[PDB]
């Protein structure tokens, strides 16, 4: 996925856990998130987001989304 397909994820998990993941430095994340999210599909990443916040309290780092 592109750079924009980045900032959407990142917006997600945002919005799952309000108050709890506030990245001190927004546009650095999204640079190093994009390293990672490159061999990716936007589609596949969102979903597995979903049955992540399903079962945690805790918000996810890049590698609980791949599987």
Known sequence: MIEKDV?????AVSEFYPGRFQPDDLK???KAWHRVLAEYELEEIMN???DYAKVNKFPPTVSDLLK
Request: hydrophobic letters at 45%; a positive charge.
């Open 7 to 11: 900032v959407q994820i990142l917006k």
């Open 28 to 30: 650095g994340t999204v």
């Open 48 to 50: 597995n987001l979903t």
